[PDB]
Amino acid sequence: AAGLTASVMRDPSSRNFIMEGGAMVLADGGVVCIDEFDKMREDDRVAIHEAMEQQTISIAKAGITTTLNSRCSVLAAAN
Amino acid sequence: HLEVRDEVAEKCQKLFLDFLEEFQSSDGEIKYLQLAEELIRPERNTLVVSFVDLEQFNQQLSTTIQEEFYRVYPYLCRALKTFVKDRKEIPLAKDFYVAFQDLPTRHKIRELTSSRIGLLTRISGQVVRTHPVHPELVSGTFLCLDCQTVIRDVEQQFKYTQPNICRNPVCANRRRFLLDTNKSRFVDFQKVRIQETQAELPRGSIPRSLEVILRAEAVESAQAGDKCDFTGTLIVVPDVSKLLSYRLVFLACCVAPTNPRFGGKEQTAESIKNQMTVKEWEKVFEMSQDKNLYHNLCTSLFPTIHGNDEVKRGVLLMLFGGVPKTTGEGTSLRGDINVCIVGDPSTAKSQFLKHVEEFSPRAVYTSGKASSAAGLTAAVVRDEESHEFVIEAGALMLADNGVCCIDEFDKMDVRDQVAIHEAMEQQTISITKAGVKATLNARTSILAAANPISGHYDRSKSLKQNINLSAPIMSRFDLFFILVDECNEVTDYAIARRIVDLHSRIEESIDRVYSLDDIRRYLLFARQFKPKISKESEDFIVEQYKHLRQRDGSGVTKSSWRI
Amino acid sequence: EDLKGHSVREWVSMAGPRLEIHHRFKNFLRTHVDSHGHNVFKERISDMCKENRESLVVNYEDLAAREHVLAYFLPEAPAELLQIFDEAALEVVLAMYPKYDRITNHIHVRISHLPLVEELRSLRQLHLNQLIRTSGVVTSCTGVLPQLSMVKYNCNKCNFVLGPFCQSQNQEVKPGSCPECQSAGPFEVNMEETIYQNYQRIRIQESPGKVAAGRLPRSKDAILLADLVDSCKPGDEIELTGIYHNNYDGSLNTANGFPVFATVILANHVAKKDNKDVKMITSLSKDQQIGEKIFASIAPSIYGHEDIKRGLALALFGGEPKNPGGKHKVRGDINVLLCGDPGTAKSQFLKYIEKVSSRAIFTTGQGLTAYVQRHPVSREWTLEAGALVLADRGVCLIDEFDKMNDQDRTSIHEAMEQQSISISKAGIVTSLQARCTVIAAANPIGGRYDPSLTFSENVDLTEPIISRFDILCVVRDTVDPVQDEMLARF
Amino acid sequence: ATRISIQCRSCRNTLTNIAMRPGLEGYALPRKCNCPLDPYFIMPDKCKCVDFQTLKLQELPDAVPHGEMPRHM
DNA sequence: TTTTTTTTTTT
Lengths: 79, 563, 490, 73
Ligand SMILES: Nc1ncnc2c1ncn2[C@@H]1O[C@H](COP(=O)(O)OP(=O)(O)OP(O)(O)=S)[C@@H](O)[C@H]1O
Ligand SMILES: Nc1ncnc2c1ncn2[C@@H]1O[C@H](COP(=O)(O)OP(=O)(O)O)[C@@H](O)[C@H]1O
Ligand SMILES: [Mg+2]
Ligand SMILES: [Zn+2]
Ligand SMILES: [Zn+2]
Ligand SMILES: [Zn+2]
Prior knowledge:
The structure is cut from a larger assembly and holds two copies of chain A, one copy of chain B and one copy of chain C.
Chain A: E1 7-10, E2 17-20, E3 28-35, H1 42-54, E4 56-61, E5 64-69, E6 71-77
Parallel strand pairs in A: 3-6
Antiparallel strand pairs in A: 1-2, 4-5
Chain B: H1 7-22, E1 46-48, H2 53-57, H3 62-68, H4 73-76, H5 78-81, E2 97-99, E3 123-124, E4 129-130, E5 134-144, E6 150-155, E7 177-179, E8 185-195, E9 209-214, E10 228-237, E11 247-257, H6 269-275, H7 278-289, H8 293-296, H9 298-301, H10 309-320, E12 339-343, H11 350-359, E13 363-366, H12 373-376, E14 378-383, E15 388-393, E16 403-406, H13 416-426, E17 428-432, E18 437-441, E19 445-450, E20 480-483, H14 491-504, H15 516-525, H16 535-549
Parallel strand pairs in B: 1-2, 12-19, 12-20, 13-16, 16-19
Antiparallel strand pairs in B: 3-10, 4-8, 5-6, 5-7, 5-8, 8-9, 10-11, 14-15, 17-18
Helix pairs in contact in B: 7-15
Chain C: H1 8-12, H2 15-30, H3 40-49, E1 56-59, H4 60-66, H5 70-73, H6 78-96, E2 109-112, E3 136-141, E4 147-150, E5 153-154, E6 188-189, E7 195-197, E8 200-205, E9 219-224, E10 237-238, E11 242-248, H7 252-256, E12 261-267, H8 278-285, H9 290-295, H10 306-317, E13 336-338, H11 346-356, E14 361-364, E15 371-374, E16 381-384, E17 395-399, H12 406-417, E18 420-424, E19 429-433, E20 437-441, H13 455-458, H14 463-466, H15 481-489
Parallel strand pairs in C: 1-2, 13-20, 14-17, 17-20
Antiparallel strand pairs in C: 3-8, 3-10, 4-7, 5-6, 8-9, 11-12, 15-16, 18-19
Helix pairs in contact in C: 2-6
The structure holds phosphothiophosphoric acid-adenylate ester, adenosine-5'-diphosphate, magnesium ion (MG) and zinc ion (ZN) (3 copies).
One zinc ion (ZN) is lined by residues 144, 146-147, 149, 166, 168, 171 of chain B.
Chain B binds one DNA strand through strand 14.
């Protein structure tokens, strides 16, 4: 869908970029389960790496400079 | 107190009423008393008087029509309501319309100055749009409100016009009348837009356009993509929002095709074999009986192209067309064949396409780099006047049942080659947009010319690697003509000779039989048969399909775009 | 004489001819047997009253047979003959069922198949105010709005209700000055005594391939009143029968520059034209060998593939959508996914299942969910149904599965294992239902399926999607001499 | 507003205690002060008010005749 | 608050 971490997408109405907090910002203290750890989008995998590193997601792009606290638990399954 | 005799109008009405009865054809037998016969059965209300005969019978009159055609039109129609009372079965409040034709002298959409308003002209152009048909109020019957009387016969002029005087000395509302609508007089009204024809465009100019207004039984003669020839009067029209600003409008009365392929009057073999003039029919027969015909149409259609004898044949078989069938379930088999050309630079590709598009009638020509998706197939446009989204016809539609010539087919974008495949497959065009839902027919045959990837055609690869079309499209053609410039020398003498001949004897050295006008006739005739298959031919066909698959068989050789 | 020298509209409006017509219709209603000695309008009125329907059908041909003069008066001035026939059928029913006054106290007579079927582009000004029968697809429908029928205002200075004016569908009704306090002013309606009636507007347009031969398809408006509303949905093929009524519009006059009026069909009878005992089926099912006999009944033309015939037949009837007692929600839909090189009648397998099945829809993959749309008629920004909610119980035929977009792919998988969609769109947050069986066909990469790799490679599809399909048929090809004749000959 | 009170503009005449009708229906301010044509305005200080929401009700899923999108009120 | 065409910044 939108992704795991946040994205910056060109809104049809605004014609400008908006911020999409994905799953790891909606899970507050909860737990996130993942499968096929090589299928996730390259950008998305980079961002999940940083999110498990720092425990927050901070995108600095076209018109977006915000921070979202990621507080969840990763239960990953590899292949 | 009483009204004034518009003498120049009534004298003309009288002389026209006389002409209608006195003028007779080659064998006595007054002709405007038999064409005016069918004028009684419902839905017919226009008599078509030729203008050259009104020149024979009289000449002090023609110069009154052709100079006051708007003053004296409301009278040349009453003088047809009296001449037709001799039938007694017409509803007494029905009204008729005179429609001229065959004017001597033509004009151009750029010669329509403002010194022409109110006269009788004649115009030729294409047709771009066609709005829907409407009723229009010509003479309202205002039911008075306080008197309960009926104010009657009030003429509108581009507005509702609300006549405000009553013949009753006690009319409490000289500003209020509820008109009825079951006695008033309506006439149909269609408004189309025409665009300057091709052969008149001054070089380096964008074509102009004007509004014509068909207003009678003539209301759906012109359709989009046609090349009709209108004959009416130029009028001025106000801006009714503030009733100033005026704008020109053509008010056509008759409309007819510009060059009839059969000059009788304008759909099977007999309906057409009737209009065939004696020489026409003794020539078409002669050709149909001709042997080696299949080699005198090539030599007579493309007279300035040395060689490629296997491409002209395909182009011909594309022009004649196959048999279109409809399966009982509701589907439909494609009837016409599509053809693509692919070759080295300067091998006469665009010349086949230009030949076909200048010969054939109703065949359109487009390049690939300067087109669109919504321009080929069909568009959606917001008419703010009606403030609605309506459908605009595209190049694949205003060439219907003809040929669409696409040059440089592989320059089109990735998304513009998709809309064309969606049409080439189902022979239709779907539209699903703002407020529009429709399915349109498209039975065109496509003739496309393309270029191999990286200039030259490499003869060690399949086709799919030499051209950048999609995968589905390359399946919907089923005739390819790969041209190559084999570096030879006996040809490089022949082509040289032919080109220098053509350039030295500009209009001669072209000795084709079957002049181009004649082939159009033969091709409009022979395109109305539906040949069948005999059992022996069916056996032959299945055997040939057997003998074609196995050539592609494994081991010995290889070919491109597998069978 | 029932025909004198006046206008047909004004002949019937006179008291004499009115009463004559009134009494003439009763004698036909009461006494009309049809080839068996059955008073058809005795059993038919009954079957109407056993349902509380207040709508009576009058086949036109029999009216012409038993009545020579009315069936010629009718399509000339039908705004009054269809009013007189109402009061006739009333007094008939209130005699066959004297208590029916407690059910709607008003009867409308429809009329079935006038002999003058017509096109939708050939309506000219000759037909203003004349009964008409046409045909064509319907492409819109507003909601069933209530319209005033017998309005009744109340004065603001006297607490007295004005006269019960009737509402005509061309001009807002205009009350005069209060006959009790002469307080001419802006009155307001009185919601308690006013009578209302249903209302719906549709836009009919020419059938796709019927008459639209070499031109664009025209359209028209229609107005369905009380009993008729919701007789047809966008996509249906109907055949109206209604007065062709015009009315003045001020906008068209300001666009075309000439006095031009709008037209609309006040529909009077809507009869759809679409697709709608066991004792044989007992032994036919008890043949014990109905399998072979049914397999070669689907795929009627396309030769071969008695393999995939089996799977698709399995899919068509379906299975059993049992509800597990452990709250696990197993699904009862069979989803199929064809695949194979181009030229093997996949698309035909889709199109024939479009026909044989019922309530089926269709789409290509090159609209899947409900989306906000500005209505053609109502001009409001409503929500319109997609392409997975129109198969909420039937089948969904997807074509060009590969050409789907990322949003389309992330939206298709949700409905497989959940069969339920949420829409938190600009319109409003809803959660609707979608129970459909998916029948799609993908393509092989490289223009040919090559069975060295697994199928999960030549399909070019996301891996957790193929799991959401039950059957995986692979169409393939080979140069085979003995079948070349078999397919060619066919 | 449930119990509203108005006032003239020029002569400053009041006509108070006016009661609105419930539901979604407004009110027709006089034009005959007893002063120019419509001299009446609302006095915001004296008007009793009550809350009101506006929901949107969709029909149950198992009662749609299954060809279309459910209707709402 | 919808198409369609054309230019320039952005993921
Ligand atoms: N076989 C031929 N016989 C006679 N004239 C020829 C022949 N081949 C080429 N010509 C002439 O050479 C020119 C060919 O140019 P075109 O046919 O317009 O270009 P083309 O074949 O479309 O190639 P490109 O890809 O578009 S440059 C024309 O002037 C032709 O008259
Ligand atoms: N075995 C067959 N029997 C009958 N028709 C066939 C057969 N194989 C191919 N066809 C023809 O091929 C067409 C189907 O092509 P299609 O499968 O739609 O191509 P694609 O899969 O590339 O869209 C049909 O219209 C049919 O006429
Ligand atoms: Mg070229
Ligand atoms: Zn008067
Ligand atoms: Zn009053
Ligand atoms: Zn005052």
